[PDB]
Amino acid sequence: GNNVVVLGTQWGDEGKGKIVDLLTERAKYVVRYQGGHNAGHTLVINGEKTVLHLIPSGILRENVTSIIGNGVVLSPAALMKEMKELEDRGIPVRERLLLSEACPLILDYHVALDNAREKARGAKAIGTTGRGIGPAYEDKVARRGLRVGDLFDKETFAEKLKEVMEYHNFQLVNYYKAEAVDYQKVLDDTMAVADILTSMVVDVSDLLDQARQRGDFVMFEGAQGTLLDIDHGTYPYVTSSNTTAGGVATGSGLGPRYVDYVLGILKAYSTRVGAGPFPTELFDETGEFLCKQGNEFGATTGRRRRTGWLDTVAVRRAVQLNSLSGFCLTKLDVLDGLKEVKLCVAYRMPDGREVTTTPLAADDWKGVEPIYETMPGWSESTFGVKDRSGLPQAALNYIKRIEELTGVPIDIISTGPDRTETMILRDPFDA
Amino acid sequence: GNNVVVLGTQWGDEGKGKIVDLLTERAKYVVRYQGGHNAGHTLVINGEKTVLHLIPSGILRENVTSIIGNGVVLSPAALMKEMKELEDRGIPVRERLLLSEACPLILDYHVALDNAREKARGAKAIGTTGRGIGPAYEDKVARRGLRVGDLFDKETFAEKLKEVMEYHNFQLVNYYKAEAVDYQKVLDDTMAVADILTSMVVDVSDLLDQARQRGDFVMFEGAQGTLLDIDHGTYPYVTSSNTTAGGVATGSGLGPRYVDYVLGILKAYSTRVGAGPFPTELFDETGEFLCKQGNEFGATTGRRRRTGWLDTVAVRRAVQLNSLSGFCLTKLDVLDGLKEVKLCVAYRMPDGREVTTTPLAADDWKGVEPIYETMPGWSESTFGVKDRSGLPQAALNYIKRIEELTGVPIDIISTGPDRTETMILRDPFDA
């Protein structure tokens, strides 16, 4: 299809970046529709590594225009820092990035807040990346946030910033008894780039409508994961953006009816960073294996990720919220070595009742235990294999099982961090 | 199609209620996916009038189950008040309504806040319905709000309410220097219905997936209007929910790929309640005519609505954000009498530049003037006409023009408040 969405079916860090990058070989635009610089993606090409956050994953391809749609909480300071490292590597970021004037802005008071808020929680810490995503979203919904389009008029901008920072400074010093953020520092910083940012402004809603009428290929790049969805994730341990396929329409401006293929990324094994319900979590040696072996460390915070067995019951959730068309099984290779592996197939509720549907709010996952289905592993290596044949029977079986239990076909298998260590069994675009 | 969405293409009050009600004759479920009790709909049957707010518009039909999906900010006090008036009229509300445990709750501190916040703005008042929608949404996104599922555990509930109300009470008394909301009053009220509410809890995401696999007819009822969209409307004069087709996926749990027909409601003339950019606004006698004649008064606040000419340029916006399949022209009758009528076809920017695309943020509509296209009116009456033939040439011409200028067919024409004063030129469901 012309419009392909790529998102996480779990808690993020499944491997969107790699997949989107490899896939935009035939794409005209790549659109980021939610989150902010809390996302940490990792593309690896000829062993050269690039870790993006705010910038869409197609930025290294010169035949694609990267757009950050109105659903992204944009941080100028963060953007620039990113823009420069990329431009230093011979990547003309400003030649290829466009963005929406409707993007809220993440300024220092937000980060100030985010940390203060988090600290207040203590034992209840959500375990946020601490980028001010939450507050940026609050001001947004609470109709007081400043947007990219507010840089077009600086005097006006000064007035507005003035009444928002003070409101914020108040609760910061008075309630949190933390340090106030300086209005003049923020004003000076923001004003030093205002022009850089406004030069890249475009009307993304309309751009996408044209791209569409013209039949152009468009790819939407999701951040975080399904179970991090503000509405549908393990509340309150979720990000503040709709990570699910639905963010595509609210965050880009495209009507839902023009979404062709929803490619859910699948990591063959599960990770989670931050506080939150994680049924299949491994606290033992295998947990360590998966982690050591999968180099599981926050691409943004560098913090270790909790790891465990593949939770099919939860994945089945992702399939329905997202209306997935297909899957992309990432990190099948990390499984090489295990004597046997297991995947969760049902949940044993704390009242002895066996259920195959996930609970909604965090609190309801409390006594939930997973009922596994154990399978024989495989010693044969699969790293870098780019063709089904090279995959041992154990591997293809696990794979079909996943499909069986979910009812969604695996369309791409990732077997290495490098862009080419892959097998495209079906290309989203010509489908 | 099996899944039909019905929403406002303008600023709300176009006539969703009437249309949804008439349309659920063949529908199994009706789902409200956004907003709260700020919406004021008006169904009229055999002259009997019902004005709903929180309760979906299919409630009077006994063959349809009404569901308020997770995207709705639900007020218990408000729900009950509504539930009772309906049940008193011989409508078994609890026999037919289900809702999501994931609905945030609108309690008194929210209303307290909403008014305080609004007052602080003074001249900048958004002109909100004053129901606490905004704050309810803030707590939501800011991961501190209480949800329907939090009534399942009252001791726990007491703890949480405690830490949220105090945070709120603080800014209420200290910052706004307004009155604090009593924790015990709120706790007692909420606890007196907790059971009533929890008995109606269902897992809407899954319900819709079943309904879908089963081919059942589902209708999604939108509140407010497109241009009130938090992301895409005239920020900051917007509601805090995504009013656009996209709310359907984030607010119900249905994957965007399962949306079949998006029916945009169209009011043949334009109204707006609240502060906000309104290019075609009439401040003269015709303005008064449209208003008097269209009984244009806030169905929720009883406040008069600003009225004007049909803004096609803005409607064209609705078409693309929403990926509309068809239109439903409401209130064609109010036009009867006018010597001639006009519709806006382009915008004259304050720099002399003629443009056919709408500006995003409120501030950018500031010096925008509309370029009309005047048409001959019609004295012949159209009230209650239920067949094209009864429509004078002036009427059918205006109609085709609207289609011409938009590229979307008018599928239903409304010509009276009563459920039967209508013409279904194409039924969304068998399309």
Ligand SMILES: Nc1nc2c(ncn2[C@@H]2O[C@H](COP(=O)(O)OP(=O)(O)O)[C@@H](O)[C@H]2O)c(=O)[nH]1
């Ligand atoms: N072994 C292995 N590593 C992979 C594979 N796909 C991606 N990676 C790497 O795994 C990580 C994927 O997580 P992250 O960078 O957070 O991806 P995100 O989902 O886009 O954030 C990065 O370390 C990628 O380079 C794969 O199939 N095998």
Ligand SMILES: Nc1nc2c(ncn2[C@@H]2O[C@H](COP(=O)(O)OP(=O)(O)O)[C@@H](O)[C@H]2O)c(=O)[nH]1
């Ligand atoms: N004259 C006339 N009134 C209508 C028509 N359709 C709906 N109404 C009435 O117009 C109003 C529609 O606005 P509202 O009740 O806010 O509908 P909403 O969009 O669902 O909120 C109510 O007064 C309806 O009964 C129509 O074609 N003609």
Ligand SMILES: O=c1[nH]cnc2c1ncn2[C@@H]1O[C@H](COP(=O)(O)O)[C@@H](O)[C@H]1O
């Ligand atoms: O890109 C991401 N990958 C994985 N988890 C994330 C990401 N962004 C946020 N989270 C998680 O979501 C919670 C809130 O993070 P926030 O998005 O910074 O609010 C924390 O548990 C984070 O670890």
Ligand SMILES: O=c1[nH]cnc2c1ncn2[C@@H]1O[C@H](COP(=O)(O)O)[C@@H](O)[C@H]1O
């Ligand atoms: O159902 C509605 N109909 C028309 N306008 C609405 C409705 N709900 C909110 N608005 C408008 O949106 C602004 C904010 O209202 P709020 O939804 O109460 O926040 C005000 O201009 C309201 O009049």
Ligand SMILES: O=CN(O)CC(=O)O
């Ligand atoms: O790559 C993104 N990370 O896993 C998020 C974090 O570091 O919290």
Ligand SMILES: O=CN(O)CC(=O)O
């Ligand atoms: O029927 C809904 N109204 O027009 C909203 C309001 O009264 O503000």
Ligand SMILES: [Mg+2]
């Ligand atoms: Mg990551």
Ligand SMILES: [Mg+2]
């Ligand atoms: Mg109304």
